[PDB]
Amino acid sequence: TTTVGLVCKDGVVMATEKRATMGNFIASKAAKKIYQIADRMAMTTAGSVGDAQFLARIIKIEANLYEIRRERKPTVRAIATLTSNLLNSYRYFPYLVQLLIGGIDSEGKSIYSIDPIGGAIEEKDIVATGSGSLTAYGVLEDRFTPEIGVDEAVELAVRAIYSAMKRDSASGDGIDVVKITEDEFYQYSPEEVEQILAKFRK
Amino acid sequence: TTTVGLVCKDGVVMATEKRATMGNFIASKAAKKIYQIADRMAMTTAGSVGDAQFLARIIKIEANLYEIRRERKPTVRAIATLTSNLLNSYRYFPYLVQLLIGGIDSEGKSIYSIDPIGGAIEEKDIVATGSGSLTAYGVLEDRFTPEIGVDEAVELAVRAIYSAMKRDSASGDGIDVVKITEDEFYQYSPEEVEQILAKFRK
Amino acid sequence: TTTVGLVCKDGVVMATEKRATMGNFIASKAAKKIYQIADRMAMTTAGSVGDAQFLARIIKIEANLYEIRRERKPTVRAIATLTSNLLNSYRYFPYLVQLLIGGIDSEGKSIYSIDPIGGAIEEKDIVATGSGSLTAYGVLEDRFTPEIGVDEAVELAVRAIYSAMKRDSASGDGIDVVKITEDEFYQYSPEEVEQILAKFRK
Amino acid sequence: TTTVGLVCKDGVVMATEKRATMGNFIASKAAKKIYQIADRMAMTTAGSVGDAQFLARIIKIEANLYEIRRERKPTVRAIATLTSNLLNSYRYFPYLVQLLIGGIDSEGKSIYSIDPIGGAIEEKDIVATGSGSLTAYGVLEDRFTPEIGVDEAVELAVRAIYSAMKRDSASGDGIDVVKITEDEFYQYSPEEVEQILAKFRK
Amino acid sequence: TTTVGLVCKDGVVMATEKRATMGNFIASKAAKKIYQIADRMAMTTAGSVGDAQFLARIIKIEANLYEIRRERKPTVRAIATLTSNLLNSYRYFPYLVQLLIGGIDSEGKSIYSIDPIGGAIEEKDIVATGSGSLTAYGVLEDRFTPEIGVDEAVELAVRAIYSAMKRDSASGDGIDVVKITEDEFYQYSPEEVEQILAKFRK
Amino acid sequence: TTTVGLVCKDGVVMATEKRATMGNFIASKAAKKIYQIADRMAMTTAGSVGDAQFLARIIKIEANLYEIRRERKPTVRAIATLTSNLLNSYRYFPYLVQLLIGGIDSEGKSIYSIDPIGGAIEEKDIVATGSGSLTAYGVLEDRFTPEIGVDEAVELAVRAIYSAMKRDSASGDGIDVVKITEDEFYQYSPEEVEQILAKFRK
Amino acid sequence: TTTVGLVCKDGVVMATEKRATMGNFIASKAAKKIYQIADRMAMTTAGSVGDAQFLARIIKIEANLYEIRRERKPTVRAIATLTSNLLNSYRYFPYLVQLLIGGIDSEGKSIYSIDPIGGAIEEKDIVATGSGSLTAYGVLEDRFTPEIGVDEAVELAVRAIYSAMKRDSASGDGIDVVKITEDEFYQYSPEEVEQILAKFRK
Amino acid sequence: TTTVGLVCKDGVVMATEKRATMGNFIASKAAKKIYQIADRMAMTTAGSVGDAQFLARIIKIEANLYEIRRERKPTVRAIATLTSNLLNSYRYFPYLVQLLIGGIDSEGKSIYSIDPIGGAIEEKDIVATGSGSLTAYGVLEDRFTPEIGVDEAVELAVRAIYSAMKRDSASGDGIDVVKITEDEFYQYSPEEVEQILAKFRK
Amino acid sequence: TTTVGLVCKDGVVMATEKRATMGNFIASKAAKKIYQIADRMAMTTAGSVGDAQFLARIIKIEANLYEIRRERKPTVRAIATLTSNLLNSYRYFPYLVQLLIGGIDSEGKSIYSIDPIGGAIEEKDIVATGSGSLTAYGVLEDRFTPEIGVDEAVELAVRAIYSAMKRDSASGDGIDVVKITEDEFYQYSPEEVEQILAKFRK
Amino acid sequence: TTTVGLVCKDGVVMATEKRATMGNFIASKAAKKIYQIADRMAMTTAGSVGDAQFLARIIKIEANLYEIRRERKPTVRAIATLTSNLLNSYRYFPYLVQLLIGGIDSEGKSIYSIDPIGGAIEEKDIVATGSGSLTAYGVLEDRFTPEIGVDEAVELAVRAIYSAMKRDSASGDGIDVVKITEDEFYQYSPEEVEQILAKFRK
């Protein structure tokens, strides 16, 4: 699995590989790795399923409660920070997941990355993180324009992953992409995303 | 020892492979892998017999408590979230077991297979699960439909676990079935498979 | 070391090996690897001597309490689940014993063998705790009939441990066999049993 | 891989199970395990398959050489002790396989077991040998009669290994047997043996 | 690292991978693992290309020389048995690599598998060697009849090795197929292989 | 440091060494590996020096306490079980020691061997704990009879310890024998018993 | 594995305790440890059945060679020192074996012991060699005389190996004795010895 | 590092060495290993320097606490018991010390050996607790008389440490000796003692 | 393992240890351990036992070869220096033995110690290689004087090693001593030596 | 172990430890490690004892042979090279010894150190070699002049050796000073040396 994330000029597009194989073993098939934290905030994870899944339940909760309490829609920066405390604190049992929490909020768009040993770093506009991590970064930076939209970003998302599939045998062949265009929370689902890269040739 | 799981339009089918070994301590072909969580929901278990049965008794209790407490039928979503959280607390009490908790519920039909590290895998499609996962995945994908007869899902499952008996000449024999159609618990039994081969001269 | 218990059509038969060694010295020849939990409920133990002797007091006390408390001789199932619960709570330093709890009760008979981390396997028959259990199981399986007298089961049981014992040096010399016939708990004692192996060989 | 060898009144019955280096999974339907050393001399082997074939040829060439050179058929003791000297010399090359040479000669019939790190001891009529050997030998001595014919001997031989197949997962499916009836040099071949093992339930 | 074969009624068909799989890397952009031993004889290797190609040139060189001395072609059987010897020398000088030698000869056609630990097995018509050899074997039995021609046998060679490159994609491109109809000694070349696998897409 | 114990018909004899050695390091010149738990109940220990000495005050003091509270002497059985609870608790940190607790009581004469992970079995025979066990058990068991006296057992103990002693410098010196003659507690003293073995020395 | 030996006043007698090492099997009902070296000389050997046979054959042949060239019989001492050079020098076939080569010679009657590291000593009495030596010595050296006959020494040999087996439940079974009285070379068979062992325990 | 503590008939004499070494360093010219616990009581130490001096502070005070609280003199058994309970409790936290606590009080004279494992009891005379201990023990036991005065005894003490000095150089350049006569507490000091044995060199 | 060695005024006396354990059997059963090189020459060994037995055979025969060849008796100096060369050649196998070689020659009386790799050193007083050496050197000086008898010597030598029995893991009573006085080569052996340690108490 | 070497106007003086202690082993208290190579050449060795002597013998032998073949006395230079070459050619038989060769020759005075791994370096007029080396250099240079004579030189040598041996627990006594004045070869030996450091007292 690999994950990438792009900061866009009308939203946030982020992508995960929802299918992972390691050899002829299917580590993940339709495995949950795309999560809705809040109405325009999403969590994408590359790494292990088991840390991903449990952590994803609590993050989602703490956002929901945040709007209930304070009557403000949570910013990415709040729920990222909260989550970093946990990853530091509970380090008595190790994690091995890289989180990308991003989305849309009222202040603007910022994407943060939480690491398996904690902390939070602001992504200026690019990341590629996971086992496909380097194959993926290059393509992003070569076609990065600061006028990147959701339309330029969805396609930029597929192609970087598509290179990772074909340069790794630790990647799957069942890509998911998630678009947040600030009018939708659309999740294209594995089939639709895959279909677009299969008229390239493989 | 392997477990499959399949979602049918008119219920859910799951199936088990028995035979227990604990080193050189050996057990007969009667050791359970099938636990009725709820009246129309089962847990098929693979991995460690010790760890599987101690958790079988906790989940059974949680389902009955829930059914009373909230005045409704159990649900696959309810229990899967509990079990996943359950394993994280008792990770310090390590239970090595691969579950599939699924059935028929008042929110539809589904299975969430729970990993021993508190993961959860979306299932409505194909999941293996077990140490015959590679062999199981072969048969289940070859013939599948979302509109699969419950008689065709027992049939598919028993051949998928026949492929595992090919690898396993002592680590697993015997075949039990969970049929859930919302009316009938049925069991294929070791016999049905053995008797074909008795007729066979090859 | 291996013990057997098997369900008869007029009770339950249990067998225990007698005489054990630690280092290069005899340490037991008058120690008991058969426990009376109630008059007509037995426990046989295969494994380390100190684990099995200590754990036996704890089942017993519970079993005495149950009669006092509930007005009732405890079912086999009820006393197995107690056993399982102790090994799970004290898994930091675990007990190295494989437990065999079979007897006769108000609700019939059953046998549950409890694994060394808690989790009990309901086995009806063809059950031996032990690591000598491979060799014993083979004889026990051929000649068991779902309808088998007490007289017969003690004869079958004796051969099972005599075959095992030649390939071990941990079962000791002298073989005990016990008959629970539902009106007595008769323990033949090593003396009489040794003389069945004069219809065999040594 | 585990073997048996019976000295019969109307020949010798030597036995092998199908195993093959190909990822530790049987090669074709028929996999080399029976080597015609000479007209009235056969080789069967428990242990390593590649070792089994390579050492088969050295003995075969020298056996054929013996017959050719001296104008006098070889004897079973001659081929047996020939094997030992060869093994112990050629130990500088990695080897470790337990060898049964047997057949018929003009001193009678006999089976000599050759150890890789020892000589050729005579073995009268009963020999075991393998990692399935405890299982195979147990039933072998019970249904021995030294008065056993080739027909009864083929059954015995197939059954003993079939039992040993059920306690390890290191023995693949299918049994070959070798008959030297003193005039013909038969290999019944996979098709025909399958029927002698499908009089049972498998 | 995997190879496949099927003996055909009018040829010998074998297929190899053109790019050794490091699991995340490849040897070079073009690479050869299908070697010509003679006009009607190829050799296809699994394991290191470095080791394999050295032994193949030695075996070629002696194949030409043997043919010249006799004025008549050597049999495929002789090539394999000479390889069993060659690898026995280089067992006292270790190499780990698995070879298959097949072709056409005067005595008919076959494929012989020659192992670093010695010996050679005549494979009747189904063959692989490697580690993903088991999935490839399975598929090779599916459409196999002795009524299969060369042109269908190349199609099926693709299907068999695609099994191990079905859930990988960094060596899903680059494949060899070798056929030998007795008119031709043809090696398809990636481009012709890509139009066959174009129909399976990936 | 080696200690032996055996039930006599008329009391219990226990023989000790009263010098303390851990191989070829001398711990103390003099030591008392005899502890009086009550008036006629006594304990010998073998294993760690540090543990034997320490443990010994604690056991005596609860035994005196049982006397005071109930105006009635603790049975040997009650001391041995109570000791098994305390070792159990102290098995969580290194506490390997073997205890022999016995004496005279109303329920007969008896010795219990107490294990470090708890559980106390009852030898009405012979038991020997220490490094000298093997040699001691050789002489002790030859002239053992259930009708043995305390006056013959004193003789028998002297011979059995002497074997360990003259052949090894890994054994303690200075044999002292302690006779529980039931109306007394007789301690022969180091001096007297050396002179019983002084029949090869002047 | 232990070999014992005692010297008679008009012969030499020796016994073995058999044990074949694979850790999976014990073969001792058709193999032996006693190989005749000269016509009235034998070698008893401890280790494995196979190690003994290969090792012994050499020594046989060289005993015959020397007999023929001198035109007079080789003494026990001569063969003993010969074996001692074999073992030290040619451990390019490495051996780990303990040997007794004893018998009747013109210059007396004797049992020589030869170590795996060579050097030949001479017990004109009791010897052992093995691990079971200490267990054997109890009955073996108590009833030893310088006037032990050949008839009394085959009896005594049985008691010492049966003492060695007494510690086991029954394991290591395989008793062969040799009688060397110059008027006979009796090389026993299991059966034959079994009836003398049937006068100490039927 | 060795320490002696021995009974006089009017006093107790206990002695110490001085100078601490690494075997390549003079770590300290003088290290404290002689304490007054009470006036008439000493603790002298063999083993680690650091644990020894920290441990002497606690005991010196809780010995004073016994004078203060109980208004009676501290007895050797009372200080020795109470030390032992602490070490035993705190054995997990770093300790590796051998304490000799002796002197004269109303109980009498007795010396107690206390292990950092636990320990407790008692030597009538002569102890070491050291590592020149073995050569120390020879001379001590040779010249020991039970009427040994304090003049005779200090000379003996000095010689025992001198046996250590020759074994391992660390007692050289300073030996300290204490005489306790139950009217004085005199400390000889290093110099005074050293100059007796330095006068052998001129 | 330890040797002692002393030069007398008119002889030489050396002695060795015996009746310990070697491998796992009692070592002295009738063993040689002081080897006769020449009439007025011996070798005693501390180290590997069976290496010394074998090596003894080589140097006795070369001592006879020097005497037969050069018409001039072997000097003490000669035989030690030859050993040096032999020990160098065998520096790869277990062969590490520290040997003292003594006797009388025309140079006068001497004992040479030879280091494991070779290396002779004249000592005309006392010597002791061994782990028993420091303890030996102690006992030796107390009544060793420049002039001593050859029957006052056998007492001292016997003493020293008996004090070393306690400093060594094992060793018994009855050891080898040899006196070589230019008038006798008398080897006492356990029976005679036992009586000389019967004045030396326990 | 340590050696020092100084160049005088008329001599070379070097010094060795003449007693080696490691644990409780003393190789002999008369043990030579001062080797005379030629008439006015010496060698003083630090490092392992046995390898010092064995290599040293060979160089004495060499000094003579060169001396005879060239007809002229050896260079200091000659033998320093010679040793280094021998050592380098014999690293399959490694001698783990640090040499110092010096003496007087026609070139004059010099001392070479030869590494245990071969190679000859030259030292101007001071040298220390071994583990005592750091302290020894400054101790030696204090009273150094090149014109310092032999009489002050042997005194000056003791102080370096003396410092190293007194902190060390590995030495404490036993030192040889070698004087080579172009007229004498004195070996001072431990006793005479003793009063040189009895001046510097404790």
PDB file of N, CA, C and O in Angstrom, chain G residues 142-167:
ATOM      1  N   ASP G 142      28.531 -56.209  42.801  1.00  0.00           N
ATOM      2  CA  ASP G 142      28.303 -56.841  44.070  1.00  0.00           C
ATOM      3  C   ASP G 142      28.542 -58.332  43.977  1.00  0.00           C
ATOM      4  O   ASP G 142      29.306 -58.804  44.797  1.00  0.00           O
ATOM      5  N   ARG G 143      27.983 -59.041  42.923  1.00  0.00           N
ATOM      6  CA  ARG G 143      27.918 -60.531  42.791  1.00  0.00           C
ATOM      7  C   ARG G 143      29.043 -60.977  41.796  1.00  0.00           C
ATOM      8  O   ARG G 143      28.983 -62.101  41.358  1.00  0.00           O
ATOM      9  N   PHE G 144      29.973 -60.072  41.440  1.00  0.00           N
ATOM     10  CA  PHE G 144      31.109 -60.386  40.655  1.00  0.00           C
ATOM     11  C   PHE G 144      32.023 -61.199  41.508  1.00  0.00           C
ATOM     12  O   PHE G 144      32.133 -61.128  42.733  1.00  0.00           O
ATOM     13  N   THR G 145      32.684 -62.180  40.877  1.00  0.00           N
ATOM     14  CA  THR G 145      33.720 -63.006  41.481  1.00  0.00           C
ATOM     15  C   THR G 145      34.767 -63.128  40.418  1.00  0.00           C
ATOM     16  O   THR G 145      34.552 -62.954  39.234  1.00  0.00           O
ATOM     17  N   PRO G 146      35.960 -63.555  40.894  1.00  0.00           N
ATOM     18  CA  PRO G 146      37.027 -64.022  40.090  1.00  0.00           C
ATOM     19  C   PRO G 146      36.724 -65.481  39.736  1.00  0.00           C
ATOM     20  O   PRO G 146      37.487 -66.140  39.085  1.00  0.00           O
ATOM     21  N   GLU G 147      35.569 -66.032  40.299  1.00  0.00           N
ATOM     22  CA  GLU G 147      35.245 -67.409  39.985  1.00  0.00           C
ATOM     23  C   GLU G 147      33.930 -67.455  39.286  1.00  0.00           C
ATOM     24  O   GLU G 147      33.195 -68.424  39.320  1.00  0.00           O
ATOM     25  N   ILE G 148      33.578 -66.302  38.679  1.00  0.00           N
ATOM     26  CA  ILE G 148      32.401 -66.224  37.809  1.00  0.00           C
ATOM     27  C   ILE G 148      32.571 -67.112  36.540  1.00  0.00           C
ATOM     28  O   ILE G 148      33.521 -67.110  35.777  1.00  0.00           O
ATOM     29  N   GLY G 149      31.623 -68.098  36.376  1.00  0.00           N
ATOM     30  CA  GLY G 149      31.699 -69.075  35.237  1.00  0.00           C
ATOM     31  C   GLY G 149      31.039 -68.357  34.091  1.00  0.00           C
ATOM     32  O   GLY G 149      30.610 -67.248  34.209  1.00  0.00           O
ATOM     33  N   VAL G 150      31.025 -69.022  32.953  1.00  0.00           N
ATOM     34  CA  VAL G 150      30.336 -68.526  31.767  1.00  0.00           C
ATOM     35  C   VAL G 150      28.864 -68.521  31.863  1.00  0.00           C
ATOM     36  O   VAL G 150      28.260 -67.600  31.378  1.00  0.00           O
ATOM     37  N   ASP G 151      28.258 -69.483  32.584  1.00  0.00           N
ATOM     38  CA  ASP G 151      26.847 -69.681  32.812  1.00  0.00           C
ATOM     39  C   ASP G 151      26.287 -68.585  33.802  1.00  0.00           C
ATOM     40  O   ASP G 151      25.166 -68.137  33.602  1.00  0.00           O
ATOM     41  N   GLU G 152      27.102 -68.270  34.761  1.00  0.00           N
ATOM     42  CA  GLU G 152      26.788 -67.259  35.746  1.00  0.00           C
ATOM     43  C   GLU G 152      26.977 -65.854  35.257  1.00  0.00           C
ATOM     44  O   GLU G 152      26.309 -64.981  35.839  1.00  0.00           O
ATOM     45  N   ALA G 153      27.799 -65.705  34.289  1.00  0.00           N
ATOM     46  CA  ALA G 153      28.066 -64.417  33.719  1.00  0.00           C
ATOM     47  C   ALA G 153      27.107 -64.006  32.663  1.00  0.00           C
ATOM     48  O   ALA G 153      26.859 -62.771  32.480  1.00  0.00           O
ATOM     49  N   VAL G 154      26.421 -64.931  31.924  1.00  0.00           N
ATOM     50  CA  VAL G 154      25.297 -64.595  30.989  1.00  0.00           C
ATOM     51  C   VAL G 154      24.070 -64.229  31.814  1.00  0.00           C
ATOM     52  O   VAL G 154      23.408 -63.215  31.513  1.00  0.00           O
ATOM     53  N   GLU G 155      23.862 -64.953  32.943  1.00  0.00           N
ATOM     54  CA  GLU G 155      22.901 -64.500  33.942  1.00  0.00           C
ATOM     55  C   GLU G 155      23.168 -63.128  34.513  1.00  0.00           C
ATOM     56  O   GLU G 155      22.352 -62.216  34.641  1.00  0.00           O
ATOM     57  N   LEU G 156      24.378 -62.878  34.918  1.00  0.00           N
ATOM     58  CA  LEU G 156      24.679 -61.579  35.481  1.00  0.00           C
ATOM     59  C   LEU G 156      24.603 -60.351  34.591  1.00  0.00           C
ATOM     60  O   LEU G 156      24.288 -59.231  34.992  1.00  0.00           O
ATOM     61  N   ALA G 157      24.988 -60.627  33.322  1.00  0.00           N
ATOM     62  CA  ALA G 157      24.901 -59.626  32.249  1.00  0.00           C
ATOM     63  C   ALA G 157      23.477 -59.157  32.050  1.00  0.00           C
ATOM     64  O   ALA G 157      23.259 -57.932  31.879  1.00  0.00           O
ATOM     65  N   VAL G 158      22.502 -60.095  32.087  1.00  0.00           N
ATOM     66  CA  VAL G 158      21.092 -59.806  31.920  1.00  0.00           C
ATOM     67  C   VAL G 158      20.600 -58.882  33.037  1.00  0.00           C
ATOM     68  O   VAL G 158      19.931 -57.891  32.713  1.00  0.00           O
ATOM     69  N   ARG G 159      21.000 -59.212  34.338  1.00  0.00           N
ATOM     70  CA  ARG G 159      20.595 -58.420  35.513  1.00  0.00           C
ATOM     71  C   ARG G 159      21.075 -56.978  35.397  1.00  0.00           C
ATOM     72  O   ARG G 159      20.283 -56.060  35.654  1.00  0.00           O
ATOM     73  N   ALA G 160      22.360 -56.740  35.011  1.00  0.00           N
ATOM     74  CA  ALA G 160      22.925 -55.408  34.831  1.00  0.00           C
ATOM     75  C   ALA G 160      22.285 -54.561  33.764  1.00  0.00           C
ATOM     76  O   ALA G 160      22.062 -53.329  33.945  1.00  0.00           O
ATOM     77  N   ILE G 161      21.962 -55.082  32.551  1.00  0.00           N
ATOM     78  CA  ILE G 161      21.273 -54.345  31.470  1.00  0.00           C
ATOM     79  C   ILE G 161      19.846 -54.100  31.958  1.00  0.00           C
ATOM     80  O   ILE G 161      19.339 -53.002  31.825  1.00  0.00           O
ATOM     81  N   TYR G 162      19.097 -55.052  32.594  1.00  0.00           N
ATOM     82  CA  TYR G 162      17.710 -54.973  33.153  1.00  0.00           C
ATOM     83  C   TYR G 162      17.724 -53.941  34.287  1.00  0.00           C
ATOM     84  O   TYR G 162      16.726 -53.257  34.429  1.00  0.00           O
ATOM     85  N   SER G 163      18.789 -53.758  35.065  1.00  0.00           N
ATOM     86  CA  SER G 163      18.939 -52.679  36.048  1.00  0.00           C
ATOM     87  C   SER G 163      19.017 -51.327  35.313  1.00  0.00           C
ATOM     88  O   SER G 163      18.416 -50.356  35.707  1.00  0.00           O
ATOM     89  N   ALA G 164      19.773 -51.257  34.182  1.00  0.00           N
ATOM     90  CA  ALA G 164      19.922 -50.101  33.414  1.00  0.00           C
ATOM     91  C   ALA G 164      18.534 -49.680  32.822  1.00  0.00           C
ATOM     92  O   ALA G 164      18.241 -48.430  32.748  1.00  0.00           O
ATOM     93  N   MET G 165      17.609 -50.615  32.567  1.00  0.00           N
ATOM     94  CA  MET G 165      16.346 -50.399  31.887  1.00  0.00           C
ATOM     95  C   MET G 165      15.304 -50.077  32.922  1.00  0.00           C
ATOM     96  O   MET G 165      14.209 -49.568  32.538  1.00  0.00           O
ATOM     97  N   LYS G 166      15.611 -50.396  34.169  1.00  0.00           N
ATOM     98  CA  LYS G 166      14.711 -50.256  35.289  1.00  0.00           C
ATOM     99  C   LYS G 166      14.382 -48.853  35.613  1.00  0.00           C
ATOM    100  O   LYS G 166      13.203 -48.692  35.985  1.00  0.00           O
ATOM    101  N   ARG G 167      15.387 -47.909  35.342  1.00  0.00           N
ATOM    102  CA  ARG G 167      15.168 -46.527  35.462  1.00  0.00           C
ATOM    103  C   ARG G 167      14.158 -46.004  34.439  1.00  0.00           C
ATOM    104  O   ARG G 167      13.334 -45.197  34.750  1.00  0.00           O
TER     105      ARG G 167
END
